[PDB]
Structure formats: structure tokens, C-alpha cells
Symmetry: C5
Subunit: 103 residues, 5 copies
């Protein structure tokens, strides 16, 4: 198994690492039908989503999607610094695959 987010991210196509080293600037979540998602931004303007669950996800990812939204909310509220995001860059906004927090 990978030992860090960069190596994990590299195991997938259409991904990249974004380095933020900053707290989340805004947290948005929706219960509207077909847009059951979260969106975060950083003060540099960078915007990321947790995608709506769909046919692109395998069953094992469903619980992890819900956990990621839990993690973003509590990171936002505690002002935790986000080190890196692994995202899929074939989506707009880029779609989060993994998060690392440090400092």
C-alpha cells in the first residue's frame, strides 16, 4: 500500500496533486436532488468538489465519500491546515480523491 498521498494519487489516471498548505476558506454542502455534494474553496480561489455519488464509483467508495465530506466539514470548522489534495482533473471543479493534513 502507498505511504503517502502523492504515491497514492499516482496510481490513478486523470489525477494530480494540488498543494494548498492552508486552511479551507469556505465550505458548501447541498441536499438538492442530483447535487448531493460538497464544495470547498481556498483563499487563492481554488475550488474543489466531493462528487455526487454515481455510477463512476464502486460500492466500496460510497462510505468513503461520506467520510470525506465529514472530514472537510470538521477541517473547515477547526481551521485545520490542508497540506495536499489528490484530485481527478477531468471534472469541474476538480474532484477530491484524497486529502492530507499536516501543520
Amino acid at each position: 500500500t502507498p505511504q503517502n498521498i502523492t504515491d497514492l494519487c499516482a496510481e490513478y489516471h486523470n489525477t494530480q496533486i494540488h498543494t494548498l498548505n492552508d486552511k479551507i476558506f469556505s465550505y458548501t454542502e447541498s441536499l438538492a436532488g442530483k447535487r448531493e455534494m460538497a464544495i470547498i474553496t481556498f483563499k487563492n480561489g481554488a475550488t474543489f468538489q466531493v462528487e455526487v455519488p454515481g455510477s463512476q464509483h464502486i460500492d466500496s467508495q460510497k462510505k468513503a465519500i461520506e467520510r470525506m465530506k465529514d472530514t472537510l466539514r470538521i477541517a473547515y470548522l477547526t481551521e485545520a491546515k490542508v497540506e495536499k489534495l489528490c484530485v481527478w482533473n477531468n471534472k469541474t471543479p476538480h474532484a477530491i480523491a484524497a486529502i492530507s493534513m499536516a501543520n
Copy 2:
């Protein structure tokens, strides 16, 4: 895809954005039958609900409704500033579709 709450809200009929830029003033929740819901108010008197789950909601919204109540409770308790609410205005109190939090 939408990149913010205003753009998301616009995708739906019978919605509008309320701009609060304030912490929640009160948080109410109920387990009484057929009123399993949350109500929030702001100091300006504005009152909003998370609707009781019902036939107006598709399955994917049910988990998101539960998450929204989780979010309002911890936003309340942490005195997190609510930036905007996307609501359906064909309900009384206006029914929350989405929330954004920012500093």
C-alpha cells in the same frame, strides 16, 4: 458543474439565496412523529427548516438531509458564520437546499 452555492441554487425551480453572513441564533430539532426536522433562526428573525423526509425527496437526498442536520447543529454550536442559504420558497419556513460557510 456549479462551482458555488449561487450557481447551484439557480438550477432549481422555486429557490432563492438568502445572504446571512451571521452565526445561527437558535437551533431546534424534533423527534416527534411526522415532525422529524430541524429549524434554525438568525437574529434578524429569519427562520429556516430542514424538511421532514418525504416523497418530494429522491433516495440520494435522504442521506444528505441527515448530513444537513448534522451540519447545522455543529455550525450552531461552534458559532460558525453562515454565508448563504439556498432555499425553496414554496415552503414555510423556507426549506434549506444548500448552505455555505465562510469567514
Copy 3:
């Protein structure tokens, strides 16, 4: 839908509003069989329960009962002021139907 806890409470028989405007003084929870419940008290001694789930509860209430115990625990630990409780007064301790929190 109700604008506030008082109007919600009034929709049910055997209910009353208790106005506390105080933090919870003690929190008790049990996993013992047939007593899977929570009990809270206030400084003046007044005691309230979240009832064990049972045949008086409709299915939609089961999730809301679990949420209420979550809410009471974090309210307790954060010393959040409880404004009002809506309770069923045909049970001893009075059984919580809804809670409002406000500063």
C-alpha cells in the same frame, strides 16, 4: 411547517414546554437491555429522558431518536444553553420530543 418549538409541541397531545435557559447539568446514557436510553438533568434537579425506542414510535422516529441522544451529548459537553424542551408528560421522567438551543 412549525416556525418554532412551541408551535411544534402544540401539535401533539400529552406535551408541554419546559423553559430552561440553562446548560445541561448531567448526562447519563445506558446500553443495558431494555433500557437503551439517555437521561439529562438541570441544576435545579429537573430530569428528562430520551425514551427507549418502542412500539409507540413510528419508523421515521428511530433515526431522530438517535440524533437527539447525539445532540444532548454534545450540548452537554459544550455547555450549550438549552432554551426549551418539548416533552411528553405522560412518562416519568418526562420524555423529550424536541429541543431548542439559544444563547
Copy 4:
């Protein structure tokens, strides 16, 4: 229903009350197979478990066991004073049936 943890405890065989009036000194939790459990200790050395779910438990206790582990973890992390534990004393470590917190 009982008004307090001492009366609750008295409804069961093989139980006793421990009065700690202290924060939890250590929190341990395990995902190891057949030992999916929590263990807490106090400064004086007293040790308690949340038992692995088992055939001695009825279905209504399953959710309550998971909630108890949630409660112990957050009590530990917040240094919340534990007033009393109701335990089964026919297990080693004694098995938690109920907890009360009062500052």
C-alpha cells in the same frame, strides 16, 4: 423508567456502581477480530471495557454499544469528568452498562 444511573443499575443482576468523579486517564480501542472493543482506565488504575458485541446482547443493544464507545472517546478527548459507571461485575474488566457525567 429510572431517574438516575444508580436506580437503572439496580434493575440488573451482576451489576455495581463505581463512583469515579474523574476524567478518563486512558482510552484504548481495537479493530482486531473478536476483540472489537474499547477499554478505559482511570488514574487510580480502575479498568473498564465496552464488551465485544455477542450473543448475550439483544438487538436493541447493538446501536447503544456503538454509541457508548463514541461517548467514551469524546469524554476522554474533552477531559469530561465521569461521575459514575454502572458495570457488570461478572466480566474482567468490568463491562460498562451505563455512564453518568456531571462536572
Copy 5:
């Protein structure tokens, strides 16, 4: 039934204790398919995983794996000192079986 993490760890093949007595330095979590996992590190470089749920795990462990990831996230965010980890050291990074928090 064990009284502490060391004795629990010793009930399993291919385990060891790590004594850290330090807060978590970084927290990583992923929703990427087949890598639905968490990774933590300490300032001395020690790296640990919560494994992806899989054929090595029995049913009873599934909730406990989810709980473990919850615990590591909140330990990280609260800067809780980790005393010891019980791990399987037949995996790279070593795989967490249990955690103790103290002091």
C-alpha cells in the same frame, strides 16, 4: 479478556507494539477505489495505515475499521497524544489493530 493494548496485541500473530507517546504529525484519507484507507505519520517518520476492508477482515471488524478512522481523524485534529499502537507488522506500512491514548 485483555486489560490493556499490550496484552490484546499479544493475542494475535504477526503483531507488535509501537510506543509513540506523541501526537499525530499527519493524517491522510482516500476515497479512491481500492484505496479507501487512512494513513498517519509521526514526526519520527513512522507511518501507519488503516487497511482497506478486505478478505482478511471478518464482518465484525467492518464497523471497527470505520470507527478507527474516525478516531485517528479526531486524535489528529485535537493533537491528542497517542501512547501506543498495536499493528500487524506483516504489512507495509504497518497496519493498525488497536490504539491507546494517554497523557
